[model samples]
Target: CVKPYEDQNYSALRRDCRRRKVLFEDPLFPATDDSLYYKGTPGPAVRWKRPKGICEDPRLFVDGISHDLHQGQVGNCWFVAACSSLASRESLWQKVIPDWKEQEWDPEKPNAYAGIFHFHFWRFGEWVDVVIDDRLPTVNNQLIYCHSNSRNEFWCALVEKAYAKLAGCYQALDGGNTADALVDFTGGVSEPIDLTEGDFANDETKRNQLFERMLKVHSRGGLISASIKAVTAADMEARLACGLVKGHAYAVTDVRKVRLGHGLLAFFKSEKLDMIRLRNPWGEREWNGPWSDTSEEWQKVSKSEREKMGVTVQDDGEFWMTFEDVCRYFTDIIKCRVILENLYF
Candidate 1:
């Protein structure tokens, strides 16, 4: 599944740069305004700079977590949400950001520095390693696109750059399907579930089956995301009173069947409630419905149970919702199944 883009070998380029005592600059994806946008100009104020120019001692990862990725100015929540889901799965993200340790800056070996980095993405039917210079688009030395929460960490921005290069330009990633990004990141088979189709929203049995399937997918280490369908262009990014954004892609982080009763009451009442956790790539505006951070539904479950679920009260773009509400509000769910082997007919 893994191959080099245009036979541009990364190790070979690094070795050549080391021998010449010069930093490698990718000619394929050059550091120019040309790569920033395909249809429009980025303006004179917007400049391209390497990580070193933006921050001192930049790293590939600093406490690599899903929350580390936050949406930038681009309307590419689909890509960001997929990346948020990817960050949680170590195996998948590791493959996407190949040679992460070597890519990280090290003061111990200053001479080993190379401005080149590569990321792998599944395109069409093969995994292509897209390489680019560390140069990133910025305004006043701050990243202008998808970036890490940690100031000096650059994996998110770099990965987004590599993806943009693959996508032709930054503007090419404006809007897309999470399933496409998920499949690119994992080389996995994507199954997009349309909740509105086939009377799916009205059928309880079907919804239950879907929940069970999502539980199994989560347990099996698959990536999932959900979104509400927007009717018009004006509805895109429009906020609902519940805090969910219309036409926005959100990472489906967890699916659980939580026990409703706690302590001694567990013996008297046995009720398992289906709940789903989702994360908005914007890093804010979470679900404000039942089971939300400030909701009283947490009282139904024990403190230990909440702790086990890693529940937090912060408005960090993560929230839990009942499966019923999920089926009711979200119009689509995309499940990316990680496949380890090639299947042939």
Candidate 2:
């Protein structure tokens, strides 16, 4: 049983914050300033701590695969992508936040906080315990890192902190491959695919084989992500023509086959079009070209077929692309297949 007044060693900073007037001044980080690579505020640096009375949402999930995960100025979308992949599998997240049930919010109670929490990161074949307090960085009374759709939800914020702690600091979490983050999250081995490799543009048979492989693994819950190569500012504006971003990471939410009609309905005819569903970590600005929801391409498929495929047209940052487009546009595909292991302490 957890004691109400227990002192958790990992939550030293958190306990300190509570004991001294509670402006939520964070002790774990340096003042928000240039050394940490932040700009926009004028004058002496200040604490980027969350607003007063803020607490984690009682619920752990927001719409279960809600691509609501958003990244802040920090360039840690790799970790966010791992979070998106982790959200898709309960078996995985339950292991990361093992004490979730015991620590959840209780609305009827007063100060229902223990000033402590812990997370586990799989590192070098071991589950390394990472404990952290609920203290989060906020600029102008808002969270400054990974966050969810709802204002009340804080799992993403706390999880990101635990990860940052593991990485030494939030700044260190920047600029990494989604595969590296996934391995940290699940102790999984990842295989990176170079889309620009041999015959990827030349051989249809080889292309089909690769497509089948993606479908096979993703259907069984493999974690996948991709990134476009170095794209300049001009390239970003120009490439919005095909719904891609320059040098940005994206999560591969899904892969499936869709039928194209000979002026027909959801044409699962003699042949079907291979499609991939991708999600931008920014949570908006989807692909606008062929196979986009607003395009005539979607009109060819009946409403029922689109529904069957779980296709929705919104600025929710999720969209479909031809498997061919996925290959042509993305420079690398990071596929991490997770192994379902029993909970470890």
Candidate 3:
């Protein structure tokens, strides 16, 4: 039980706001340019707006999905991708967004609207609740940082604010390791797999083992992310010709060993393809490699097989890549293992 940030109790503040019939205005993280960026002042055109001002009847979530998250101007793809990965696991996300119903905007309880929200993050050795006012940085009525694809949804942006407060300022969250973010979100150990240093790229056996490990972790509600290594600051967010962004993290949404042939032909064809599905936090752009959605290589696989694997040909930032291509391109793989204690045992 770590004290709330700056010792400001969320419950007490919210209670005071409700009793006074006044909306919350956090003194710790006030709505100002200072909270937007650590260094440099925001332009005159920039403004801080509450969720209500930004959207019509803002909601905490609107059918929360991994694709609902879109990266804003901030270069915190690590956090955004981790959030995308987290959203897929209900148990994990529920823990992070505790008391969501109480935090959400309710039309009936207008008096209980405090404009304050809190989220839990595993900090150091303990889980800390970071609270913040719902004032978000925007420019020309558009959210400048993380936002959801659904205009009415504000959970992603609010969660980002709470995280930014925990990190000191918005700019402080610019770039970070996915492993650190995953650990912070889940309080789980992160195992980093360095494809460059190991024989993963050349050895098929090792690659298969890694794929199996990822499948097991994913099935167990763990979070995973992958990114290309950047050697210099200038190399960050560099777009490759293949539509993949270097130095930017992508959520590892799935791992599958897809069958290549249909019914009778499948019996003779002993071919199995190892594929991995990755979702870019930007919510656009995807891999343009061999097994990409529109690639001719997909012709070998039957429609039923593709459907069973959840294949869709869209530029929604989520794409399937062969494990061979993954080992060749992505330099780092961060796996956040979810430890499930056997109560019966």
Candidate 4:
């Protein structure tokens, strides 16, 4: 690990105070407040998990973003990987998202927050998602679980437009875009580490570099193939020194879809065709050999020789493959999508 976590210079980055975020100092999540969630007019209380009653409101299916996800706690990063990988394909997000500004308001859906994002990942893919939400939490770091699960401090914002942080927070990771369509590789074992884990001097610059790189990766709708390959600590050091080993994967997308209960279980459209693209952080380093770029097709090229084509050496499944190939792998492992909203995908 690097010696120190890095500090970021957000001053250089374009930020909309009204639209960017809820800073750590922000009033949200104060000692875990409540009242921030929507107190939907309740109906005749029904026994949860009971056979004859509807546990959730029909309005939940208002065709918008959902919340309290990770509810199933399904350990579905593999699915996230698959979805991220697919978004890596050429301009897939474009096909999913079109009229950005007009598609803004969810007048028909309540408890929905929406925003656009660009994401990047290695051993997976890149894209954006227009995330909408159901309700918010007191600190805004969490979801509105009703008064039962909410903090007393949370209340509807007096100035709704000022709560832009919620808009950025709820989208992206709250099961928006092609989340349901991605592959979950880690089985939910690995988690998102604060990219600034190293001392500020060492980690901050890298974090900013990563943020910039991430922006570029999304512009092209790239893919990031992940692998648990064996590497010397020295190799780890090199990646760390170069600020390329982000240590995880994710995709930002503009795709939007509607689910009956979850509202948006998966995204259905984009600015262009729905694509599933992937990127290799190792500059195309993946398990080499069969089913990789080194396969028959590129063999005829001068630089396509086995060694020159590092794909011949990558670990399994870290190279580019079609969705069909992913479905085949799904048989061997579980594919679930786990996303941390407002954070990296």
- Using lDDT as the measure, which candidate wins? 1
Between candidates 3 and 4, the one scoring higher on TM-score is 3
Question: What is the Cα-based TM-score of model 3?
Answer: 0.85
Q: Considering TM-score, which of the candidate structures 1 and 3 is the better prediction for this target?
A: 1
lDDT value, candidate 4, whole model = 0.27
**Each prediction's TM-score against the native?**
0.87, 0.77, 0.85, 0.23
- Give the residue spans of candidate 2 off by over 4 A: 1-67, 231-239, 259-270, 308-316, 342-345
State the lDDT of candidate 3 residue by residue for 11-30, as single tens digits. 99889988888889988877
Single out the weakest 10-residue window by summed lDDT for candidate 3.
336-345
Residue 102 C-alpha lDDT in model 3: 84
Ranking by lDDT: 1, 3, 2, 4
Candidate 4's residue-wise lDDT over 1-345, tens digit each?
111101211221213332555221223322211222223433222211110122223222123221111211212223333433443433332233223223333446522322222121212233222121223332223322221111221111111111223223212233422223332221121222222232322444653454344334444333333322114545321343212232224233312111122211243122221222234421333323323556543343234332433323223223443233322221121122333231133
**Model 4 bad stretches (over 4 Å):** 1-24, 28-165, 168-175, 179-305, 313-345
Model 3: lDDT of residue 52: 85
How well is each residue in 273-298 modelled by candidate 2, as lDDT tens digits? 78888877666847776677787776
> Which candidate achieves the best TM-score against the true structure?
1
Output the better candidate (2/4) by TM-score: 2
TM-score of candidate 1 against the unseen true structure: 0.87
Q: Candidate 4: give its CA RMSD in angstroms.
A: 22.3
Give the Cα lDDT of each candidate.
0.78, 0.65, 0.77, 0.27
